[PDB]
Design a protein around this ligand. Structure first.
Ligand SMILES: Nc1ncnc2c1ncn2[C@@H]1O[C@@H]2COP(=O)(O)O[C@H]2[C@H]1O
Length: 1024
């Protein structure tokens, strides 16, 4: 049988592909040409050696139904899967216009050329097949160069997407015309052609979308079963293609393209291991398909094609190559006016790169082989295959090689100075580390005899890339570029620790790089605003739907299931008895459906009774009664011509479905919630990342630039942008409560799980945890993380009493929570009201539970606070006039706790975690964060890292002595929160929130109660 033998041939193909790919890695030409040469050699051998001819012939000739039904789906799905879906979607308008219309025009022009130039005297359909074959490209070679050489990813994504779309459309057009050429059919009605177009073009993407959504849905509900995920993902593609193309007659390739794009986009629903495995697997399948196709082309072109090739054919091939290149260039130029004014916008040199990069690939050869096989013995098949192979060889020999030099000639090859400098710095750092380790290793007793001459040569890494106003302006530009670079660094740091998702980092870095190329330009809040600006369609849909949705626990699901049951007889009988108009089926159906209608009616009556006659007050109940009456009338008058019978079969058949829609509406609400959540999460991530980056860059810039004027101006710019962004973010919470709460909780759980994984890794590195149980714990962590993606899109906002239950200093003891609850008074305000003035006397605590408040006051401080923040916290502790004004921005609502009530609580709650201790720790962390930051800014720690580190610290009891001695061997950082302190030795006075210097071995204070000392310290991870 062929089953094992084809495996032998396929393995031989893999071996030849490996040889060609390896032995000529450093040569310019791609390995596919070598594969073609090997195939030609094998073909000529088989033509003269019957021994191997018998073996080869039985498998070399492949049926058209293995190429189209297997190879092409593999190639197309692999091409789609490896695509960066987000950038593709963001350029989709331009890429789709170009792909579709350019393909149509190019194929038409190529067909016209073929008809006019070639003496084959083909008809138009054959010429269209020819043009469709010649218009399919495969730039995988050029996209790699554009990816490696410089940050021109816009061009690479555009060209790859154009390749994908034109390949799909070329396959569709070829399928359409191949039928007219080789499987002629009777003249079709215009409506028939319209329906054919709808089936091929519209039904394909819809079928693919449906299957993709179902597949991702099921994937989201699989945990710790990587094998099942892989199997489902693989089976989905082939089932989609087969059902679409064979059974539904729908264009399979487009469905597969849509499935690939969707599955690639929804990467979060797939465990990362499965993601990488699938990527590699599909790449390998595409590689095998390419090698097989190329070798088959060589074999068959030598066997039976070149025998029917004349001198004029070579001239025709050369002319055709020139003509197709010129046609692609002309198409790009013709569409340039439109493309330039949408999406990225192609530059003059980008057009040349695209034109020259139009490499033809395996898809064209597969279609040519299909044509050749179908032709059988006509010259048309041989000529088609010869021309396609010639074009592919020419492109892979000329374009695929000269593209590298043309990149330089156009000036796109050079790597930018910033990347060169970064690479040089990294190389120098690596060399210094290598020198350190080399020096260290020579001390080992068990490595002293090492031949360092060899070691140095082996490990070394080489550089891969180897006061005047006119002066003040130069300084200003230099500082601007510096700050942009620092912002980029901060964004990357945030991402690497998981503070941000990949898309947010992409957007932020794109904006930062764009802002550099404009004079005196900085990242603008308005530019970022588009990220978190919710498209109005979905809010409009939610608002409209919520109106419509506005007797025990399951009396409605029962009727829903009843409709879900009886849809089947209604849909089936009235569209089956038309054919059948066996008997006992109708005998049962008649009375069974009649009694079904009766039971529904009686259940409606039961609920009318259990709820009273007011049941009919509801709007939808009126419709239910109406459909009940219609069914009653028709059935009863039947039980008492066709047109008085089809009033059931068509009309009532239609009406019975309608009342089911009242269950779909809630699900559509939940789906719109998911969409709005997906947008709002990205908006929040972008805004938060920008704010954090600005905060850090302010600290860094404080010391980076010496020029005081530039320092002041840049700090003003940064603060002005940050305040705008934070206010804009705050408004969103008011706009959509539930979705905001959902996103916030999601991110909180994500961060907690990330730190849990980090702790597990730390434990394993230390060895305290066994090398195996770590994987069990990490598995639990990973499944818990994946369960987040299924979290509800919206969560009802917690009531205020819960907000009091969760404040950091209250939460640890329900006796204190129930005490403070008994006295807290809820207050309300209007826009513009002032809660506290600067320098007024102390009244108590405010906990903000709704709305937004703006703070202003001398340290100069201007920022906004939102729900869950505590305000006035120092005024009950230090018994001092207020440090700032707080003004309401949007109908603020707050809990207030009076100074007397706090004094009583503090006097009455003095367990080990003293209430005063908790209150001072919450003040101390917020006051110390900036102090630690400004000292540690240059170093690696981020603000989140600084806060988490400080969290380990504690306040000193500071009652045994009014002098503190510091053990640097066990103490990491020392912060004086409040009080007056002085060094024991030098007696220098400290009377401010200050970071204690290292040299201070012993501190000293005074007994005066006018400023009670409060010292916060952080100890080493070890004891003491
Ligand atoms: N730099 C700041 N950052 C955040 N909150 C502040 C800042 N400065 C002052 N506040 C708050 O403003 C409040 C005004 O009243 P209190 O001084 O009692 O307590 C103050 C703090 O809660």
């Amino acid at each position: 049988a062929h089953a094992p033998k084809v495996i032998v041939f396929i393995s031989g193909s893999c071996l030849f592909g490996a040889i060609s790919r390896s032995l000529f890695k450093k040569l310019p030409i791609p390995y596919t040409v070598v594969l073609l040469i090997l195939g030609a050699i094998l073909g000529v051998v088989a033509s003269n050696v019957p021994l191997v001819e018998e073996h080869t012939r039985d498998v070399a000739h492949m049926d058209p139904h293995v190429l189209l039904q297997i190879f092409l789906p593999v190639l197309i799905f692999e091409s789609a899967f490896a695509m960066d879906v987000h950038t593709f979607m963001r350029s989709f308008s331009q890429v789709c216009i170009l792909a579709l219309f350019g393909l149509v025009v190019a194929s038409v022009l190529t067909a016209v050329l073929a008809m006019n130039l070639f003496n084959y005297n083909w008809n138009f359909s054959e010429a269209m097949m020819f043009g469709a074959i010649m218009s399919a490209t495969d730039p995988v070679a050029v996209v790699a160069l554009l990816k490696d050489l410089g940050a021109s990813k816009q061009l690479g994504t555009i060209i790859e997407g154009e390749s994908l779309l034109n390949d799909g459309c070329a396959i569709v057009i070829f399928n359409v015309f191949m039928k007219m050429v080789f499987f002629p059919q009777l003249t079709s009605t215009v409506g028939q052609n319209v329906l054919y177009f709808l089936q091929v073009a519209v039904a394909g993407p819809l079928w693919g979308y449906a299957v993709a959504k179902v597949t991702v849905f099921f994937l989201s509900h699989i945990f710790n079963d990587a094998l099942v995920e892989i199997t489902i993902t693989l089976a989905a593609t082939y089932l989609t293609y087969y059902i679409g193309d064979i059974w539904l007659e729908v264009s399979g390739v487009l469905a597969v393209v849509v499935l690939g794009l969707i599955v690639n986009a929804e990467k979060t629903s797939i465990s990362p291991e499965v993601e990488v495995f699938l990527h590699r697997f599909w790449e390998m399948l595409a590689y095998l398909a390419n090698t097989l196709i190329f070798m088959m082309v060589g074999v068959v072109v030598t066997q039976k094609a070149l025998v029917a090739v004349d001198k004029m054919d070579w001239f025709y091939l050369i002319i055709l190559y020139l003509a197709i290149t010129i046609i692609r260039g002309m198409v790009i130029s013709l569409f340039s006016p439109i493309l330039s004014r949408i999406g990225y916008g192609l530059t003059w040199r980008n057009a040349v790169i695209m034109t020259w990069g139009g490499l033809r690939g395996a898809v064209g050869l597969a279609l040519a082989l299909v044509v050749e096989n179908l032709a059988g013995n006509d010259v048309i098949g041989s000529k088609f295959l010869f021309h396609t192979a010639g074009i592919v060889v020419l492109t892979l020999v000329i374009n695929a090689t000269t593209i590298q030099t043309l990149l330089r000639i156009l000036g796109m090859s050079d790597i930018s100075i910033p990347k060169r400098l970064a690479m040089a710095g990294a190389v120098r750092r690596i060399h210094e580390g290598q020198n350190r380790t080399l020096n260290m290793l020579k001390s080992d007793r068990f490595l002293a005899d090492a031949d360092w001459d060899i070691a140095t040569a082996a490990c070394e890494i080489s550089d891969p890339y180897s006061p005047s106003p006119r002066e003040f302006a130069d300084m200003m530009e230099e500082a601007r570029l510096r700050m942009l670079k620092a912002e980029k660094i901060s964004y990357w740091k945030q991402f690497e620790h998981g503070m941000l998702a990949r898309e947010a980092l992409r957007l932020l870095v794109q904006h930062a790089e764009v802002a550099a190329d404009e004079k005196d330009q900085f990242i603008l809040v308005d530019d970022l605003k588009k990220s978190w600006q919710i498209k109005g369609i979905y809010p409009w849909l939610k608002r409209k739907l919520e109106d419509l949705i506005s007797h025990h626990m399951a009396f409605e699901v029962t009727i829903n299931i009843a409709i879900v049951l009886n849809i089947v007889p209604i849909i089936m009988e009235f569209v089956v008895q038309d054919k059948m108009a066996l008997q006992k089926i109708e005998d049962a159906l008649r009375i069974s459906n009649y009694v079904f209608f009766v039971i529904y009616a009686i259940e409606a009556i039961v609920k009318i009774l259990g709820l009273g006659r007011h049941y009919i007050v509801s709007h939808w109940n009126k419709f239910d009664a109406f459909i009940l009456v219609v069914a009653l009338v028709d059935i009863i008058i039947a039980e008492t011509s066709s047109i008085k019978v089809v009033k059931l079969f068509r009309l009532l058949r239609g009406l019975r479905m309608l009342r089911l829609t009242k269950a779909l509406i809630p699900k559509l609400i939940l789906v719109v919630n998911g969409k709005i959540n997906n947008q709002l999460s990205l908006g929040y991530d972008v805004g938060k990342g920008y704010i954090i980056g600005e905060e850090e860059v302010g600290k860094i810039i404080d010391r980076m630039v010496d020029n005081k004027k530039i320092l002041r101006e840049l700090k003003h710019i940064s603060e002005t942008g940050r305040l705008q962004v934070v206010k804009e973010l705050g408004l969103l919470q008011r706009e959509h409560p539930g979705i905001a709460v959902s996103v916030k909780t999601r991110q909180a759980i994500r961060t907690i799980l990330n730190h849990s994984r980090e702790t597990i890794h730390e434990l394993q590195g230390a060895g305290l945890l066994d090398e195996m149980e770590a994987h069990k714990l990490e598995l639990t962590v990973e499944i818990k993380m994946k369960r987040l993606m299924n979290a509800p899109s919206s969560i009802p906002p917690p009531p205020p009493e819960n907000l009091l239950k969760n404040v950091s200093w209250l939460a640890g003891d329900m006796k204190l929570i129930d005490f403070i609850k008994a006295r807290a008074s809820l207050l309300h305000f209007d826009y513009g009201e002032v809660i506290v003035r600067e320098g007024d006397e102390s009244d108590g605590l405010f906990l903000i539970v709704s709305g937004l408040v703006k703070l202003y006051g001398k340290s100069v401080f201007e920022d906004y606070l939102t729900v869950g923040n505590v305000i006035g916290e120092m005024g009950v502790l230090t018994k001092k006039p207020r440090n700032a004004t707080v003004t309401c921005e949007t109908t603020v609502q707050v809990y207030f706790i009076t100074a007397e009530d706090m004094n009583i609580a503090i006097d009455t709650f003095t367990l080990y975690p003293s209430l005063e201790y908790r209150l001072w720790r919450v003040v101390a962390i917020r006051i110390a964060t900036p102090l630690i930051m400004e000292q540690m800014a240059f170093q690696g720690w981020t603000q989140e890292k600084v806060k988490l580190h400080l969290e380990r610290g504690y306040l000193v009891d500071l009652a045994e002595s009014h002098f503190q001695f510091n053990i640097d061997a066990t103490l990491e950082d020392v912060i004086l929160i409040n009080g007056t302190a002085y060094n024991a030795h030098t007696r220098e006075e400290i009377r401010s929130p200050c970071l204690i210097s290292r040299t201070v071995h012993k501190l000293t204070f005074q007994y005066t109660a006018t400023e009670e000392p409060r010292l916060f310290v952080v100890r080493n991870a070890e004891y003491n």
